[PDB]
């Protein structure tokens, strides 16, 4: 419930672990798409929304029409950022300790004209 | 106020191979399906004009879907209702439960919550088109919504008028900015001519602060404006002409400027006294010439747009009869 | 590689928390991953550190994927070639 | 409960005094401290044998009597 | 006088937009040979896009998206481009290097 | 309206004032009622506006189910201000370096301007400022001492007059500090010391604390401490004003102290700088958030089993049991080129291998089990078919500990259709990559199911690449044991019988 | 294990870039990966013949005397320069190493000798007739190829335009330039044809290009793993041979310990003169 990842091992009918060492091996091989698959699609991977105007977690819902940033009542500019529920929990826990995490989305880039 | 604005956004391309077959056509179509008809960046988007700049069709790298994305900088036509704007047509949707709701029927959608504290508002009946004035508060353009949200009340003209203290002379560089505002009036003035002169007279007399009988129209070369009760027999100065003469070195406006209630707001007439020989309850406003001219120029557009919109809203006698109570309400406060 | 990293700043630096703090001070997330998350976070907050997202540890902690290997380069659709060789679906 | 001697397949209901069964290896209800399951376990490829002097080894292949030397 | 701290959002100023600067073709300095990573990425992206939409310029027929993408890469028909980001100058530019896979050398992927 | 695709390019850490908590809070905790029937009590620590942890109700804030809502923060208005547990030392330093009567510093800004910004404040705090006199205030700076019984209490002993500095008084003190002082001292605008006092703490999103325990203790959860904090805040009088030289009733002092202690334990309890559930205790250690969840992850679609030798498998092949090939699936998107090849899998279903398990309809955006499928169901372009693993499909073969980049390699699967075999089988010469032996060693195998992952595995992580060791640049694989001895015997010039020769039949039989 | 994790996090952010350099967020750690820009798995040990030869032996073996032209004297002089540079550099490596000794075997990206031998065997045509023009063409081809060799670190566009080459790239290509000079000396490739020579050069360039390190490589993790693995063998082995214990010295190296804490310190001082060093009694005094 907390992290959203599979449960632990065969005893709980969960998944199997790919610890830090496996991630080091995969990064050394350069297998980033394999990492995406295993650690996001087969794991707690999720979509998180951040307001570009203030770099804070926005509120977005397509089915029920919601497009809302708390800090930017108007002027909200929401972009969707691929993340992991574990990372979102990490950032929420950091915020819980009065540490304000501000995410700077990569700037938009345009051709000369 | 219809205007041009420039936006920046990112579009998700779900079928990059098919999208790139015709980028321009696909790009415009996607923008219209997403933004047109919604509030975005403290504005309401009416129609997309074009794309100023865009980016190549990048491919998402943080997920295993093959979808692409594109940054686009497009200019659209947006409407930003300010404070004190006059909305001619506001159909009441719900008056019961001491709650008065009305949605405008003009080019710029807006939902107005009319307070029940004022008695005049309670006179409104559901399904009746009634002119409204937006309150001093700013309009909330909640992003994503399909219409603005504001609060206003039935337009009862007020006698309280404000003088503005003019100290700095208007700079030719500043003049160029104002000429754009002047251009808006010219189009509005031309449109007013097309509307029959009989219908404008009824409404302008109704919303004139002072009661006036049928008299000779105070005709001007710019427009045939109506007459009014002269205050101190002063000579009004045609602001529209002034800017026209301002382009001819006639930029002397250091004296005081004001438009007392006895002036028909639509007509471009300004009583520029040398001194503050006004019944101004509040002290003159120490403002620059640009601030004053912009303040007064936008006032003309607000009222001029109001009259033209009134004629179109009420073009048959059946409707005018249906809202006799509304018209009579202005008479009660008429002074 | 070992020697060049350990002598990057002109002085011999360790392969430890002290050495990392001297080579990549702004990388708050990487140093958090190594050890002492709470102390690193406190110093970063009081310092108001700005942490660029690079390397392996920082994107991983931010939930993203490192921009290395297959993700180093960018792929962009070739509009000209597609326009000249392909037909729109709505035919 | 369930009858004694019943094939307890994966994803079945065995009411005990524990219905779920996800061991993936079929079992049999030995008794109904109750609900005993017994498996007929033979020597399988991958089982580990060892001589008395250490020498642990894994059964990697099984051959018919005709193929043995 | 007493000062009340504003919120972090008010102080925050979002990064200004950048302008793509395509280095002229003759001023490129990166390798004219696909790296193994780049070829793998090209093939994977093209295969996924084929999965989304089956249109292709390959004459031969294959029953799986991966083979179509690999053969498009080897026969120089893949409709993608490779953009190498050299530097992001603080002035607000993103200097890049656009390469056409149909003309570059292809590594040994088998 | 749609949210475009973006990626984080930088993270900025800053101290969060109560103003931020007020701005970013969906709800405001008012009542202490844990639950109102089945649904969460409104205005409580479980208010659905903050998020949802059950399938019965959705997120009021963003109308999402338990999944797809990221947790939505809240607020709690503290009647008495509270010092931030995470920045006690900063408060101490600022008190040491700042005049209490006025905001002007009691030290020389030029005395430390030369130092780099992060050190300036530390050096000023270290410098002795116990007896100095403020230039604009005739007051002499007192002596600041930290109580030895807690980590969050500050005493001001002035000429032997001991007085406790309550959080409201500290807030007043820091309120007068001018911005120029913080800038010169090194800290930035966002780190103004006034922020270090909170009058409204943040209630964590419900996501961080999913252990609501609905459905009917000894375990201790973060929710209990938050409920205690809410109750004690309710106990405190709402309008309490403290003054530097003012006394307070004993019970009030104890209540404020216990609220401070509750907040401190909630944020940091076991952090060093048993029933101690802390937000910050979750981060450190091998079992902490960062090392167990973010760095490394549990994954689906993965198998583990014992390994065995098989001389008939190539170096780059692994023998996969049939049952595992049925459990793990490969997702194929139906298309015009795919349809004919995918039809046999669809028809076989779960009855005969090769088959399938599920199909995802593109029109309906839903997945259906193949077994219960209705006859009307067909394979239309755009659907995803989850077929079985067949011979030739690549897979990732891993042995732990993963000490080398060869510790994970991609092997072409060979499905062992014999139901008896239940072990992964690889050529003995392949054990060099993984440093493995057929002595009971186990290995992990997972089959890529996404087109991009499959392409990456087949083109990049094939074991063919790990033939030459990165560590040493020499070969990794070759003949071992029986193969070496047999090579010697075959190439041996003379045998005990005589010359090492064979007839045509046996020469052919060598290559068969 | 512990030092393995510490090293991994220390070297994590070292990633190759589009210039083939190693950097940590644009901050250089190496001007060129490994100072050669090559993958660790694309190298094979090769022997340099000229290193240990005497002056007279080198002249006898490599100085081609078929044609009385200054070009061949220049080529032999280039071989001599390369030999002297190799000696001077690697003799110096001896002078700041306890026991590291000069060798004539180095790991190179391409085994030129193997290419030449395979081409000769595949297309054997006997002793070719002495064609003076052909020899000069082959020499010019090898000279131009050596000059353009550093461009393998750049595209073929810059090679065509002949833009300036960085000095560090020239240095990176120096070793392979010397090996090519040795293995393609006019004496060695006397039977090779011009078409065969062009094929050999193209194959050499292709093999060189295929050996360069990829752009997104996480080389820091590779180094961490490759150096952590042998440590465990040292840890156990040092225990059996046991200051100088398995863990004491690696910690000293990887913690930048001060000299005071440097246990098992040593020095290798040498006698003032080449003559007195032979005597052991003087050394003992
Ligand atoms: Mg073993
Ligand atoms: Zn915002
Ligand atoms: Zn939600
Ligand atoms: Zn003072």
Swiss-Prot record, chain B:
Its main location: host cell. Part of the viral DNA-directed RNA polymerase that consists of 8 polII-like subunits (RPB1, RPB2, RPB3, RPB5, RPB6, RPB7, RPB9, RPB10), a capping enzyme and a termination factor. Transmembrane segments: none annotated. Contains an extended C-terminus, with no homology to characterized proteins. Keywords: DNA-directed RNA polymerase, Early protein, Host cytoplasm, Transcription, Viral transcription, Virion. The lineage of its organism: Viruses, Varidnaviria, Bamfordvirae, Nucleocytoviricota, Pokkesviricetes. Belongs to the Asfivirus DNA-directed RNA polymerase RPB7 homolog family. It comes from African swine fever virus (strain Badajoz 1971 Vero-adapted) (Ba71V). Component of the DNA-directed RNA polymerase (RNAP) that catalyzes the transcription in the cytoplasm of viral DNA into RNA using the four ribonucleoside triphosphates as substrates. Induction: Expressed in the early phase of the viral replicative cycle. It comes from the Viruses. This is DNA-directed RNA polymerase RPB7 homolog.
Swiss-Prot record, chain D:
It is found in: Host cytoplasm; Virion. Coiled coil: none annotated. It comes from the Viruses. Induction: Expressed in the late phase of the viral replicative cycle. Part of the viral DNA-directed RNA polymerase that consists of 8 polII-like subunits (RPB1, RPB2, RPB3, RPB5, RPB6, RPB7, RPB9, RPB10), a capping enzyme and a termination factor. Belongs to the RNA polymerase beta chain family. The binding of ribonucleoside triphosphate to the RNA polymerase transcribing complex probably involves a two-step mechanism. The initial binding seems to occur at the entry (E) site and involves a magnesium ion coordinated by three conserved aspartate residues of the two largest RNA Pol subunits. Catalytic component of the DNA-directed RNA polymerase (RNAP) that catalyzes the transcription in the cytoplasm of viral DNA into RNA using the four ribonucleoside triphosphates as substrates. Forms the polymerase active center together with RPB1. Part of the core element with the central large cleft, the clamp element that moves to open and close the cleft and the jaws that are thought to grab the incoming DNA template. This is DNA-directed RNA polymerase RPB2 homolog. It comes from African swine fever virus (strain Badajoz 1971 Vero-adapted). The lineage of its organism: Viruses, Varidnaviria, Bamfordvirae, Nucleocytoviricota, Pokkesviricetes. The chain holds residues 920 to 1016 of 1242 of the full protein.
UniProtKB/Swiss-Prot annotation, chain E:
One of its GO terms (molecular function) is DNA-directed RNA polymerase activity. It is found in: Host cytoplasm; Virion. Its main location: host cell. The keyword Transcription applies. It comes from the Viruses. One of its GO terms (biological process) is transcription by RNA polymerase II. Keywords: DNA-directed RNA polymerase, Host cytoplasm, Transcription, Viral transcription, Virion. One of its GO terms (cellular component) is DNA-directed RNA polymerase complex. Belongs to the archaeal RpoK/eukaryotic RPB6 RNA polymerase subunit family. Component of the DNA-directed RNA polymerase (RNAP) that catalyzes the transcription in the cytoplasm of viral DNA into RNA using the four ribonucleoside triphosphates as substrates. Part of the viral DNA-directed RNA polymerase that consists of 8 polII-like subunits (RPB1, RPB2, RPB3, RPB5, RPB6, RPB7, RPB9, RPB10), a capping enzyme and a termination factor. This is DNA-directed RNA polymerase RPB6 homolog. The chain holds residues 38 to 147 of 147 of the full protein.
Swiss-Prot record, chain G:
Induction: Expressed in the late phase of the viral replicative cycle. Catalytic component of the DNA-directed RNA polymerase (RNAP) that catalyzes the transcription in the cytoplasm of viral DNA into RNA using the four ribonucleoside triphosphates as substrates. Forms the polymerase active center together with RPB2. Part of the core element with the central large cleft, the clamp element that moves to open and close the cleft and the jaws that are thought to grab the incoming DNA template. Lacks the typical C-terminal domain (CTD). Part of the viral DNA-directed RNA polymerase that consists of 8 polII-like subunits (RPB1, RPB2, RPB3, RPB5, RPB6, RPB7, RPB9, RPB10), a capping enzyme and a termination factor. Transmembrane segments: none annotated. Belongs to the RNA polymerase beta' chain family. It is found in: Virion. This is DNA-directed RNA polymerase RPB1 homolog.
